[PDB]
Symmetry: C2
Subunit: 613 residues, 2 copies
């Protein structure tokens, strides 16, 4: 394709996006026009593309590319976006730090989808000046790395917003038993309000971010339950949390003002607005920030509307953060992400929201692929620009090079048949994997035949998809191996309980001689495949924890075989593990009557024994 | 030997102790006499043994056995014990639950040493009636098991005292995400004061213990920092901790009174005694309990005296708890235990203490042998009965069948040359083992040549000792393997840093091809040897956590080899792990100027990454 009206900046972007777009031998002319977010119009090889915001050019050309692929000649497209800012926020604090190359890929995909902004969540994973323990051995970003990421986004006229923490959720930093770090602590993961060395630290955070072009920052500031109840309490006696939050927030905003930043934060702290002089405090502080209403779970527009209404009682400057579910193990939940996005988008439009942030958290080890949620991301983009999903497949094919319905099956390990579609967090991918074999704590939440057959079938389906997945094959290979592994693990784990209950040492011998070696090898192979995935996407740091988890699982599989062999041979008279009555693991979904559940802490799944305390 | 004056009960005990005593063809006559704790007198094959308390008979016969072995014919021994009660308390809450057989061995040894009482520390490791999650998958004792242990001690006229928890330190129980358990929680490891379901639980604890003969119990009741600051705060607003402690303690003592128990507890809660109506509260509650002053660390009599004096300001009923250091990894510290015992014994005698409890805690996984502290136990017995250690070797040979100085070398993995003798907790046995190879967080606390050579020499020494160790060989074999493993791990870990710093890929190839396979195999073999030790001594439950830790260590050794190989081959241009500047791990002993330190949490040693949060 040839172009008229391009800047040199746009020319370089199109070179970077050439592999995504299939424009062929056409001529495109560009126009800037505020009347409508995107317009694409033309026929017989000559097209005119108009965009309102510069970054929208790249969605416009994706739309054109898709329309021509669909066999159109005559093209008439017009989109009015609902949101002035649409952002994706990746988590780089849960052990998985996105490497620069994958950050650049994400940016390119985001650009084509229509996102204006890229955000990284970094608790402790950037460098401060005079804080050598901050991000120590975590793969923290250097100033140069962050500039490289911000500059790459800017090449597509996209913004960059760091998401940091200025009070709590700094657990990886505060663990260091050094006075210069311990003196910063209140309790658990929380910094000490009123401590001048804490305000020195926070100023250090802003001095790092000041090296960026952006002057928009998310400072966190959610309300932790123990704020003021640790070393603060010992130093100052009990204080009302809201007053301490006000005092701390004012200090943080004064520092932000000094460096020219405008701050966003989670709205939680202000819920009480929705003693006389603390109310007055909150009211003056609320004027200085953009509040972000975060909700990842609700299945109906009206629930969202109710919350937007309550927020609008105190401020008109309310952004919304929704969720691309990738924080529940090795497997995402794009399907659930779709369900809530559809409803959240309705409510955001009704309540005149100007900014939507899609969050890609990574809870408890960052085990899900950084690119597992591309379907959810396209879904929010389609909803923001078109208010429907009618073209989600056509556009996704440009973004990713592959089929949307194929890619949605990445979810399969979580998609147990007949689960209600509107319940969040149900994550058998993870707990079926990490539970012990001799002492399987989640055994009562597993349907041994029904779930096994789901995983077996899923592995076959993903195996075929991986063969036509191109540059994303590796993520589907991981999922194919996991599903197959889970099927066999359930077969062996349930098989042991039954055969032991019935004294069938012959079936036990079969398990010990054949199936255990198979399982062990499948786990070793999955570990190898997972490591490839990790290294493609993230910095090496953080992988060590997954090494520990997988290494432990392997040793416990080995133990299970060994214990059974000794029982079969008569070296021991019983396997005491197999004599314990198993109980429900949790009652999280007891009211809904489910068998499956949500279990999202490795250390609680893996053993009943103490491991951290 | 033949006897006159024995009961049938004493006859059965002597049958059980026959293997320990070597009385030969002598005649012994027994007398009960309060004038002196023990007297042994006679010559030419005829001896008279007198004891004050019935259990003292077994120390008396040990003394006789030792004197005859020493070649004496004429025997004149007289001991006045300083303490009416001398107790050993084993930890069965840190994952290592002493099995019945090992409990019986310990009791026999304790009897010969002169202990009156055996205690088990059980947070959640016994059964309650209507609390199926209490001790779930932990190897909790059944009522029958506890009766068996109490009855075995009673066979030697020794008492049994359960040590339980009635407020905090119940972390293994409160982790269960079931409403019937979560409703009992304040925050972290602490139960909810004022909650009637909590008093139902506590009454359940006493109903279990009421099946025992003993009516003496240690109820814990130390003061946790967050007491009242969790769900309590949300339900009731802020309250003074001491008042809440008073309210809870009164409820607990009312329950104890109902079942006929007399309670001991740690003295901490009453330090403030040493608002008008809370002071009055404390003063009336102090009358109803025995307070235990616990101190495991102090190197001088006067420090203890100062504390006894402060305690005696509020009560004359103060017991003392000292420490048999076995809670710092895989290796005990009998040497340090000796040093503080010598001083604590002086202060206990000066301050007219009637009960001393020697505690054998097992912090963070219960990795030290249950029988690793026999030397410390003999030391406290000698000090209680003789006030000196002049016969510690002679008597220990009866207790254990082996040499005291040999057995004291069990400590070697902690005994780095030139450490000051009076600093506690320095535990290279554990942190040198668990630290990563690519990312060695404690590397700056290691002297690579000096420490390696200590461990290498120690392994040779323990190897010889194990060959003459009899029924305890297995514990010295474990220690021999650990010391040898640590020497090589240091050699490889330091070797990698140096060779990588200097670009020596040849030395790197040598490490990768030869030394890594050696190390991996040594770790697998140590795991196997450790598992034998564990299974000899404890219930199977709890071993799973050590499986996880060792399994993780192995996978990380494998990762280190693999990363180096890829670097050597050119698959990668660098090993980023090896480019990080290493910092001190902690500054715990910075004021003392030490290189080695104390690091006693596996999850903080193993990785900088998040693993529990």
């Amino acid at each position: 394709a040839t172009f008229l009206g391009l800047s040199s900046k746009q020319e370089k972007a199109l070179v970077r996006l050439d592999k995504y777009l299939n424009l062929g031998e056409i001529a495109v002319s560009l126009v800037t026009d505020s009347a409508t977010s995107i317009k694409v119009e033309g026929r017989q090889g000559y097209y005119q593309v108009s965009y309102k915001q510069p970054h929208q050019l790249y969605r416009a050309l994706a739309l054109l590319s898709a329309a021509l692929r669909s066999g159109q000649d005559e093209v008439q497209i017009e989109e009015e976006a609902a949101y002035e800012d649409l952002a994706y926020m990746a988590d780089c604090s849960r052990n998985a730090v996105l490497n620069l190359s994958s950050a650049k890929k994400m940016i390119e995909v985001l650009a084509l989808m229509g996102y204006s902004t890229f955000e990284l969540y970094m608790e402790d994973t950037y460098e401060i000046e005079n804080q050598p323990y901050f991000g120590y051995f975590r793969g923290r970003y250097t100033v140069a790395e962050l500039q490289e990421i911000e500059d790459y986004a800017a090449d597509f006229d996209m913004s960059f917003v760091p998401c940091i923490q200025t009070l709590a959720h700094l657990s990886a930093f505060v663990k260091w038993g050094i006075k210069e770090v311990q003196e910063l602590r209140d309790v658990e993961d929380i910094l000490l309000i009123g401590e001048e060395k804490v305000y020195d630290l926070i100023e250090g955070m802003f001095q790092t971010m000041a090296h960026l072009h952006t002057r928009k920052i998310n400072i966190g500031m959610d309300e932790a339950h123990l704020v003021g109840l640790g070393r603060y309490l010992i130093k100052h006696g009990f204080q009302n949390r809201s007053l301490l939050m006000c005092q701390h927030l004012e200090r943080v905003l004064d520092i932000a003002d000094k460096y020219g930043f405008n701050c966003q934060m989670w709205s939680d702290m202000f819920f009480k607005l929705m003693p006389e002089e603390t109310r007055v405090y909150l009211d003056r502080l609320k004027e200085r920030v953009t509040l972000v209403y975060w909700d990842y779970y609700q299945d109906s527009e009206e629930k969202y509307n109710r919350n937007f209404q309550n927020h609008h009682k105190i401020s008109q400057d309310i952004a919304f953060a929704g969720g691309a579910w990738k924080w529940i193990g090795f497997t995402p939940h794009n399907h659930f992400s779709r369900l809530v996005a559809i409803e959240a988008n309705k409510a955001c439009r009704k309540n005149q929201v100007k900014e939507v942030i899609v969050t890609g958290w990574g809870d408890n080890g960052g085990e899900t692929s950084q690119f597992s949620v591309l379907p959810a991301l396209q879904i929010w983009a389609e909803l923001a620009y078109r208010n429907d999903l009618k073209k989600v497949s056509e556009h996704f094919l440009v973004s990713t090079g592959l089929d949307f319905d194929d890619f949605m099956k990445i979810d399969l390990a979580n998609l147990l048949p007949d689960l209600p579609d509107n319940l969040s967090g149900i994550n058998p991918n993870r707990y079926v994997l990490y539970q012990d074999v001799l002492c399987p704590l989640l055994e009562q939440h597993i349907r041994p035949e029904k779930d096994k057959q789901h995983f077996a079938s899923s592995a076959q389906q993903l195996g075929e998809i991986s063969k036509r997945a191109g540059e994303y094959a590796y993520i589907f290979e991981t999922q194919a191996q996991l599903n197959a592994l889970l099927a066999l693990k359930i077969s062996i784990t349930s098989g042991i309980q039954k055969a032991y209950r019935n004294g069938d040492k012959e079936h036990l011998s079969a398990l010990a001689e054949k199936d255990f070696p198979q399982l062990y090898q499948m786990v070793e192979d999955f570990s190898d495949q997972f490591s490839r995935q990790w290294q493609q996407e993230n910095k090496i740091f953080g992988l060590d924890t997954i090494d520990i988890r997988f290494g432990g699982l392997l040793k416990r599989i080995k133990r299970a075989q060994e214990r059974l062999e000794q029982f079969i041979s008569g070296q021991i008279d019983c396997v005491e593990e197999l004599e314990q009555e198993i109980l429900p693991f949790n009652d999280f979904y007891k009211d809904q009557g489910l068998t499956a559940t949500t279990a999202n802490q490795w250390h609680l799944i893996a053993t009943a024994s103490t491991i951290y305390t």
